[PDB]
């Protein structure tokens, strides 16, 4: 079922985004590819 | 164009994240998917 | 190294979502393709 994220990081060194879950112990996480860049 | 996101969720059952959108009826999502785990 | 997410946006007409990140100047992004659609 769907949690809230309590926290919202990226890391330019690994491209990967991590969003830490209300749920548990409060160290599960969703975490995913992206771009990582200097924009405008 | 971009919006913001009113509400950030994720699912360790269907492993996706399900962004809320700013936007509309309120009931415009981003949906990705991600994996899901336990991190130390 | 993960940094804080200062503003999350997405974008029904590039099908992305930007997370602009707490790091050097503020134009740091990550950026990741989705899906965008109206949900119930």
């Given at each position: 079922a769907?949690?809230?994220v309590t926290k919202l990081?990226?890391?330019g060194d690994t491209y990967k985004?991590?969003?830490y879950?209300?749920?548990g112990d409060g160290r599960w996480v969703?975490?995913?590819?992206?771009?990582?860049?200097?924009?405008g």
């Open positions: 769907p949690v809230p990081v990226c890391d985004c991590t969003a879950l209300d749920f969703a975490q995913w590819d992206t771009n990582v860049f200097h924009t």
